[PDB]
Chains A and B, each alone.
Chain A
């Protein structure tokens, strides 16, 4: 069996959310072995802490980023980056706070 480099499938270019609300963005991907998922904003990794507002759920072919109680300072350019033993991929989405 053969490795497959990670490949992000569709990620939106721009998304918007009202202050104080929950935002969810889901993104599919492929790659073998299963790629490690990193979400980052302004070049700085997002840490999925169970005691906080940022939560990341990853499966074999899906990542979901959930931001609860969205603050004005949560806005910015978010990068999803994937890595396995055969390569990497990245895509950015611009998250706007209303």
Chain B
């Protein structure tokens, strides 16, 4: 019907270690694409401080407290019967001196 595509691409975030960090994207396609997030080649699962809030086309990755073990490249993968779309963003986590 119509493959996935990004109305709004996910942007890099630079955050102080221990503070909140979020990636946001807006995904279109028909039927509405299912979105999952990947890091290190593996699909991320929800946890105590990682969740994946979504409101319609708007899909997000939320770290309630971002630690250095969370830094790196996150991939947003959107999927429906017509295709798949991929976009990445760097989360940078800054440790105080």
Contact of A22 among B3, B6, B77, B89 (CB under 8 A): B3
- Interfacial residues of chain B within 1-54, with CB under 8 A of chain A in the complex: 3-6, 9, 11-12, 38, 41
In the complex, how many residue pairs between chain A and chain B have their CB atoms under 8 Å apart?
Answer: 64
Q: Are A11 and B88 in touch, CB under 8 angstroms?
A: yes
Q: Are the CB atoms of A28 and B3 closer together than 8 Å?
A: no
Contact of A9 among B6, B84, B90 (CB under 8 A): B90
Find chain B residues with CB under 8 A from A11 CB: 88
Size class of the B contact interface (CB-based, 8 Å): 20 to 34
For chain A, give the interface size range: 10 to 19
Given A9-B12, A21-B3, are A14 and B41 neighbors across the interface (CB < 8 Å)?
A: yes
Say yes or no: A24-B5 contact (C-beta < 8 A), given A12-B75, A13-B41.
yes
How many angstroms between the C-alpha atoms of A15 and B5 in the bound complex?
15
Cα distance, A25 to B5, chains bound together (Å): 9
Inter-chain contacts of B90 with A (CB < 8 A): 9-10
In the complex, are the beta carbons of B83 and A25 less than 8 A apart?
Answer: no
Question: Are A25 and B9 also in contact (CB < 8 A) when A10-B73, A12-B73, A13-B41 are?
Answer: no
Q: Complex formed: what's the CA distance from A56 to B11 in Å?
A: 21
Which residues of A lie under 8 Å from residue B3 when comparing CB positions?
Answer: 21-22, 24
A23 within 8 A of B: yes
Pair A21/B83 contact, Cβ less than 8 Å: yes
